[PDB]
């Protein structure tokens, strides 16, 4: 089964110019993200090749959702795992204001307004991790079955913790399209920074951007 307790432990086990600071922190969190994934139930039992495919497919959305939830109490800014607050004025003045505002409006503010807890965040990240549409998986059905168990557990958790909010489970799932769209746009920026070549991109972040 897929108990939300274990998913919550995985989140708590990994708790801690602007473009350069964000790219450096991203490389640091990629190491932490592997440790998180190995604590998600049944992920390590998957074929090694598929664990790679899932992490290469979801790392961007997984880590974007992480810092978004970490930034709840931050006003008009985000909090990186290194402890650095990046304010939206800094992002605008570095040329990435539009996508930064998208994170604040579509992700951080929505997480703040509903008070998304760390169990719901973990389940949402687990759903993203267990992405059955990832190309090249040796068995898409197994990953789809794992995703179904996660959101069967998360719905039951929502209905128990927040009985007064019937649409809350659906509200959580309906932030994934925004997360998908924002992840893709952030990838486009990274590839541009790489192309220009004056932004420090460390080895692990660089490996995520290379071809399969």
């Amino acid at each position: 089964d897929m108990p939300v307790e274990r998913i919550l432990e995985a989140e708590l086990a990994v708790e801690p110019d602007p473009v350069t600071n964000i790219c450096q922190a991203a490389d640091k969190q990629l190491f932490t993200l592997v440790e998180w994934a190995k604590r998600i139930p049944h992920f390590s039992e998957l074929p090694l090749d598929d664990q790679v495919i899932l992490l290469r497919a979801g790392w961007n959305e997984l880590l974007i959702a992480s810092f978004s939830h970490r930034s709840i109490a931050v006003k008009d800014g985000i909090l990186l795992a290194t402890g650095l607050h990046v304010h939206r004025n800094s992002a605008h003045s570095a040329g990435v204001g539009a996508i930064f505002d998208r994170v604040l409006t579509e992700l951080v503010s929505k997480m703040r307004d509903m008070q998304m807890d760390k169990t719901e965040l973990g389940c949402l990240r687990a759903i993203v991790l267990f992405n059955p549409d990832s190309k090249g998986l040796s068995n898409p059905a197994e990953v789809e079955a794992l995703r179904e168990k996660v959101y069967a557990s998360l719905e039951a958790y929502c209905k128990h913790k927040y009985p007064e909010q019937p649409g809350r489970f659906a509200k959580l799932l309906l932030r994934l399209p925004a997360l998908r769209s924002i992840g893709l746009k952030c990838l486009e920026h990274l590839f541009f920074f790489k192309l220009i070549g004056d932004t420090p991109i460390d080895t692990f972040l660089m490996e995520m951007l290379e071809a399969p």
């Binding site: 592997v34 790679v52 692990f204 490996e207």
Partner: peptide
């Protein structure tokens, strides 16, 4: 992908 394989092997 050297790094990801090595960390998942542990």
């Amino acid at each position: 992908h050297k790094i990801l394989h090595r960390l998942l092997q542990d």
